[PDB]
C-alpha cells in the first residue's frame, strides 16, 4: 500500500519472510542425529538386483 505522498507499507511490516520447509509433516532422524533421506521403491516388472 503506497499513498501519493510517499508513505508506504512493505512486506516486512506485516509478516516475516524466510526460507523454510515446504511441508512440516514428516521428519526423520538416524541414531538420534537429525537426518533426512529418500526411500526408493521399485517399478513392477524390473529386476531388484540390478
Partner 1 sequence: NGQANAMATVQQLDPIYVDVTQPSTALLRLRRELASGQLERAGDNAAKVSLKLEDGSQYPLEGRLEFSEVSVDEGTGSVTIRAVFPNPNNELLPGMFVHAQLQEGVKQKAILAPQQGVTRDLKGQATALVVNAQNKVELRVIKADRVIGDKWLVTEG
Partner 2 sequence: LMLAAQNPALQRVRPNGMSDEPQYKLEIDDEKASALGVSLADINSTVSIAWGSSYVNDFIDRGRVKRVYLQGRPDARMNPDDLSKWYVRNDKGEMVPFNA
Partner 3 sequence: EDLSNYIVSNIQDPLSRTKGVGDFQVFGSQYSMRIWLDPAKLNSYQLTPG
Q: Is 2 in the site for partner 3 (CB under 8 A)?
A: no
Q: According to CB under 8 A, which one of 2, 5, 6, 22 is a site residue for partner 3?
A: 22
Distance CA 30, CA 33 (A): 5
Q: Which of residues 9-38 bind partner 2 (CB under 8 A)?
A: 16, 19, 22
Do 36 and 28 touch, CB atoms closer than 8 A? yes
* Binding footprint of partner 3 on the chain (CB under 8 A): 1, 9, 11, 13-23, 26-28, 34-44, 46-48, 50
Amino acid at each position: 500500500k503506497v499513498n501519493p505522498d510517499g508513505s508506504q507499507v512493505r512486506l516486512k511490516d506485516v509478516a516475516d519472510v524466510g526460507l523454510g520447509g515446504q511441508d512440516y509433516s514428516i521428519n526423520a532422524q538416524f541414531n538420534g542425529s537429525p537426518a533426512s533421506g529418500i526411500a526408493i521403491k521399485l517399478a513392477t516388472g524390473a529386476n531388484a538386483l540390478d
